[PDB]
Design an enzyme around this catalytic site. Sequence first.
Site, PDB file in Angstrom:
ATOM      1  N   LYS A   1       0.870  -1.183   0.000  1.00  0.00           N
ATOM      2  CA  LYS A   1       0.000   0.000   0.000  1.00  0.00           C
ATOM      3  C   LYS A   1       0.901   1.225   0.000  1.00  0.00           C
ATOM      4  CE  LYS A   1      -4.061   1.891   2.332  1.00  0.00           C
ATOM      5  NZ  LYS A   1      -4.897   1.778   3.555  1.00  0.00           N
TER       6      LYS A   1
ATOM      7  N   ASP B   1     -12.537   3.908  10.265  1.00  0.00           N
ATOM      8  CA  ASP B   1     -13.074   3.572   8.952  1.00  0.00           C
ATOM      9  C   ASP B   1     -13.635   2.156   8.991  1.00  0.00           C
ATOM     10  OD1 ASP B   1     -13.683   3.441   6.303  1.00  0.00           O
ATOM     11  OD2 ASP B   1     -11.708   4.191   5.633  1.00  0.00           O
TER      12      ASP B   1
ATOM     13  N   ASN C   1     -13.022  -3.010   5.113  1.00  0.00           N
ATOM     14  CA  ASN C   1     -11.809  -2.980   5.904  1.00  0.00           C
ATOM     15  C   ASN C   1     -11.823  -3.986   7.044  1.00  0.00           C
ATOM     16  OD1 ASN C   1     -10.958  -0.657   4.319  1.00  0.00           O
ATOM     17  ND2 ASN C   1     -12.356   0.544   5.598  1.00  0.00           N
TER      18      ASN C   1
ATOM     19  N   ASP D   1      -6.664  -1.081   6.904  1.00  0.00           N
ATOM     20  CA  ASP D   1      -7.027   0.312   6.637  1.00  0.00           C
ATOM     21  C   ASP D   1      -7.040   1.023   8.002  1.00  0.00           C
ATOM     22  OD1 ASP D   1      -7.808   2.475   5.033  1.00  0.00           O
ATOM     23  OD2 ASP D   1      -9.450   1.364   4.076  1.00  0.00           O
TER      24      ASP D   1
HETATM   25  N1  LIG Z   1     -16.368  -1.497   0.107  1.00  0.00           N
HETATM   26  C1  LIG Z   1     -17.800  -1.673   0.511  1.00  0.00           C
HETATM   27  C2  LIG Z   1     -18.540  -1.665  -0.816  1.00  0.00           C
HETATM   28  O1  LIG Z   1     -18.652  -0.267  -1.286  1.00  0.00           O
HETATM   29  C3  LIG Z   1     -19.809   0.518  -0.851  1.00  0.00           C
HETATM   30  O2  LIG Z   1     -19.485   0.859   0.502  1.00  0.00           O
HETATM   31  C4  LIG Z   1     -18.771   2.088   0.509  1.00  0.00           C
HETATM   32  C5  LIG Z   1     -19.672   3.227   0.909  1.00  0.00           C
HETATM   33  O3  LIG Z   1     -20.814   2.723   1.595  1.00  0.00           O
HETATM   34  C6  LIG Z   1     -18.858   4.022   1.895  1.00  0.00           C
HETATM   35  O4  LIG Z   1     -18.362   5.205   1.227  1.00  0.00           O
HETATM   36  C7  LIG Z   1     -18.453   6.331   2.107  1.00  0.00           C
HETATM   37  C8  LIG Z   1     -19.766   7.073   1.798  1.00  0.00           C
HETATM   38  O5  LIG Z   1     -20.869   6.207   2.054  1.00  0.00           O
HETATM   39  C9  LIG Z   1     -19.891   8.283   2.718  1.00  0.00           C
HETATM   40  N2  LIG Z   1     -21.174   8.959   2.383  1.00  0.00           N
HETATM   41  C10 LIG Z   1     -18.770   9.278   2.402  1.00  0.00           C
HETATM   42  C11 LIG Z   1     -17.403   8.607   2.652  1.00  0.00           C
HETATM   43  N3  LIG Z   1     -16.374   9.554   2.135  1.00  0.00           N
HETATM   44  C12 LIG Z   1     -17.234   7.286   1.858  1.00  0.00           C
HETATM   45  O6  LIG Z   1     -16.018   6.709   2.336  1.00  0.00           O
HETATM   46  C13 LIG Z   1     -15.465   5.833   1.343  1.00  0.00           C
HETATM   47  O7  LIG Z   1     -14.642   6.698   0.534  1.00  0.00           O
HETATM   48  C14 LIG Z   1     -13.500   7.208   1.243  1.00  0.00           C
HETATM   49  C15 LIG Z   1     -12.779   8.186   0.325  1.00  0.00           C
HETATM   50  N4  LIG Z   1     -13.869   9.085  -0.182  1.00  0.00           N
HETATM   51  C16 LIG Z   1     -12.577   6.058   1.619  1.00  0.00           C
HETATM   52  O8  LIG Z   1     -11.445   6.585   2.310  1.00  0.00           O
HETATM   53  C17 LIG Z   1     -13.305   5.113   2.559  1.00  0.00           C
HETATM   54  O9  LIG Z   1     -12.532   3.936   2.698  1.00  0.00           O
HETATM   55  C18 LIG Z   1     -14.663   4.689   2.002  1.00  0.00           C
HETATM   56  N5  LIG Z   1     -15.442   4.212   3.183  1.00  0.00           N
HETATM   57  O10 LIG Z   1     -17.668   3.320   2.205  1.00  0.00           O
HETATM   58  C19 LIG Z   1     -17.744   2.029   1.610  1.00  0.00           C
HETATM   59  C20 LIG Z   1     -16.395   1.663   1.050  1.00  0.00           C
HETATM   60  O11 LIG Z   1     -15.819   0.699   1.928  1.00  0.00           O
HETATM   61  C21 LIG Z   1     -21.117  -0.264  -0.901  1.00  0.00           C
HETATM   62  N6  LIG Z   1     -22.138   0.563  -0.192  1.00  0.00           N
HETATM   63  C22 LIG Z   1     -20.973  -1.551  -0.109  1.00  0.00           C
HETATM   64  O12 LIG Z   1     -22.199  -2.262  -0.175  1.00  0.00           O
HETATM   65  C23 LIG Z   1     -19.897  -2.395  -0.748  1.00  0.00           C
HETATM   66  O13 LIG Z   1     -19.748  -3.590   0.027  1.00  0.00           O
HETATM   67  N1  LIG Z   2      -3.380  -6.980   4.493  1.00  0.00           N
HETATM   68  C1  LIG Z   2      -4.362  -7.199   3.633  1.00  0.00           C
HETATM   69  N2  LIG Z   2      -4.879  -8.451   3.533  1.00  0.00           N
HETATM   70  C2  LIG Z   2      -5.877  -8.695   2.667  1.00  0.00           C
HETATM   71  N3  LIG Z   2      -6.469  -7.833   1.837  1.00  0.00           N
HETATM   72  C3  LIG Z   2      -5.927  -6.576   1.956  1.00  0.00           C
HETATM   73  C4  LIG Z   2      -4.909  -6.181   2.798  1.00  0.00           C
HETATM   74  N4  LIG Z   2      -4.633  -4.835   2.639  1.00  0.00           N
HETATM   75  C5  LIG Z   2      -5.475  -4.458   1.715  1.00  0.00           C
HETATM   76  N5  LIG Z   2      -6.299  -5.464   1.247  1.00  0.00           N
HETATM   77  C6  LIG Z   2      -7.366  -5.415   0.209  1.00  0.00           C
HETATM   78  O1  LIG Z   2      -7.360  -4.266  -0.632  1.00  0.00           O
HETATM   79  C7  LIG Z   2      -8.382  -3.294  -0.350  1.00  0.00           C
HETATM   80  C8  LIG Z   2      -7.778  -1.907  -0.180  1.00  0.00           C
HETATM   81  O2  LIG Z   2      -7.108  -1.799   1.079  1.00  0.00           O
HETATM   82  P1  LIG Z   2      -7.405  -0.560   2.048  1.00  0.00           P
HETATM   83  O3  LIG Z   2      -6.291  -0.459   2.997  1.00  0.00           O
HETATM   84  O4  LIG Z   2      -8.790  -0.662   2.539  1.00  0.00           O
HETATM   85  O5  LIG Z   2      -7.337   0.674   1.027  1.00  0.00           O
HETATM   86  P2  LIG Z   2      -8.200   2.018   1.128  1.00  0.00           P
HETATM   87  O6  LIG Z   2      -7.764   2.753   2.340  1.00  0.00           O
HETATM   88  O7  LIG Z   2      -8.128   2.685  -0.171  1.00  0.00           O
HETATM   89  O8  LIG Z   2      -9.707   1.490   1.340  1.00  0.00           O
HETATM   90  C9  LIG Z   2      -9.075  -3.842   0.902  1.00  0.00           C
HETATM   91  O9  LIG Z   2     -10.481  -3.615   0.790  1.00  0.00           O
HETATM   92  C10 LIG Z   2      -8.785  -5.341   0.759  1.00  0.00           C
HETATM   93  O10 LIG Z   2      -9.666  -5.890  -0.227  1.00  0.00           O
HETATM   94 MG   LIG Z   3     -10.913  -0.608   2.001  1.00  0.00          MG
HETATM   95 MG   LIG Z   4      -8.750   4.080   3.888  1.00  0.00          MG
END
Ligand SMILES: NC[C@@H]1O[C@H](O[C@H]2[C@@H](O)[C@H](O[C@@H]3[C@@H](O)[C@H](N)C[C@H](N)[C@H]3O[C@H]3O[C@H](CN)[C@@H](O)[C@H](O)[C@H]3N)O[C@@H]2CO)[C@H](N)[C@@H](O)[C@@H]1O
Ligand SMILES: Nc1ncnc2c1ncn2[C@@H]1O[C@H](COP(=O)(O)OP(=O)(O)O)[C@@H](O)[C@H]1O
Ligand SMILES: [Mg+2]
Ligand SMILES: [Mg+2]
Length: 263
Positions: free
Chosen positions: A43, A189, A194, A207
């Site tokens: 990462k 988060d 995550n 994460d």
């Molecule tokens: N990865 C999960 C998948 O993606 C979606 O979930 C995503 C969504 O809900 C949620 O997104 C949320 C929004 O909501 C909320 N309204 C604003 C917030 N900035 C945003 O945050 C998202 O974008 C950020 C960067 N801007 C990233 O740093 C963060 O990891 C991510 N949670 O975070 C989830 C990502 O983890 C689907 N909903 C879910 O069903 C599917 O399983």
């Molecule tokens: N140590 C790990 N083991 C397994 N999967 C991982 C690991 N680190 C990251 N990943 C995979 O990659 C994706 C991105 O990692 P993450 O740290 O969540 O990035 P971001 O902060 O952009 O969401 C995770 O949702 C997961 O699918």
């Molecule tokens: Mg993630």
């Molecule tokens: Mg993140």
Amino acid sequence: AKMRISPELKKLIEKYRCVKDTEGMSPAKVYKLVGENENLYLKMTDSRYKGTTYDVEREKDMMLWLEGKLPVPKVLHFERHDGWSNLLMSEADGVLCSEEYEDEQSPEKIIELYAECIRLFHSIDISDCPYTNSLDSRLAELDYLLNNDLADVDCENWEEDTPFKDPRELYDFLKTEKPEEELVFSHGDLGDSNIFVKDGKVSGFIDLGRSGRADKWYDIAFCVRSIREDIGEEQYVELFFDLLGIKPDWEKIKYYILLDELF
Ligand SMILES: NC[C@@H]1O[C@H](O[C@H]2[C@@H](O)[C@H](O[C@@H]3[C@@H](O)[C@H](N)C[C@H](N)[C@H]3O[C@H]3O[C@H](CN)[C@@H](O)[C@H](O)[C@H]3N)O[C@@H]2CO)[C@H](N)[C@@H](O)[C@@H]1O
Ligand SMILES: Nc1ncnc2c1ncn2[C@@H]1O[C@H](COP(=O)(O)OP(=O)(O)O)[C@@H](O)[C@H]1O
Ligand SMILES: [Mg+2]
Ligand SMILES: [Mg+2]
């Protein structure tokens, strides 16, 4: 401009078949290092975010601190090469929560896992926690992110709720409605993307950029958010709370949800 990885790390990545992630809506680059004996995860975050809660340099510190505390990956290699924080880590144990019930229709099991994380976090002693992420430090960071256009203020996935029409409006409301804070261990988060589960329990957390000290309603708020959007039945939101054995502070929950709108 800049670059990416160092020679050393260019060796390991060559030894393993590398695949580029697309599950990280963040400013970080995520690569899976498919290997024969195992898989590793790389990462990377560019300089622009150094010292911010996206900086893996920080995610690494926190990842190191959770050893023997929470189920987190193992910090293999870390480096700062060409204004880039690069972290090499081991593959989390278990399956991604989003892909363990991807078909889903096991609502109560998800609610259990969410509630399990919460109770779990309220166990990690923050006496020596490296970072404190109180609203002060967070509103500080936000302000900073906005001043340097480091945040997406146009094309984000807003909540259909956010009553505000512009970034600063929200910032103001936050900087102005700050709830009192009861610092517990916060993930920063908490979401199925995550979190890792196995055989029915949580087996991994990743994460960890905003991981550290923070009000207790912060994570809870996140679980409510996910629960609502992914199951959509007030019924299981109530259950979540029943499993937690706590009454909902809808003001804090809303508040904290908003705080995440710009990150
Ligand atoms: N990865 C999960 C998948 O993606 C979606 O979930 C995503 C969504 O809900 C949620 O997104 C949320 C929004 O909501 C909320 N309204 C604003 C917030 N900035 C945003 O945050 C998202 O974008 C950020 C960067 N801007 C990233 O740093 C963060 O990891 C991510 N949670 O975070 C989830 C990502 O983890 C689907 N909903 C879910 O069903 C599917 O399983
Ligand atoms: N140590 C790990 N083991 C397994 N999967 C991982 C690991 N680190 C990251 N990943 C995979 O990659 C994706 C991105 O990692 P993450 O740290 O969540 O990035 P971001 O902060 O952009 O969401 C995770 O949702 C997961 O699918
Ligand atoms: Mg993630
Ligand atoms: Mg993140």
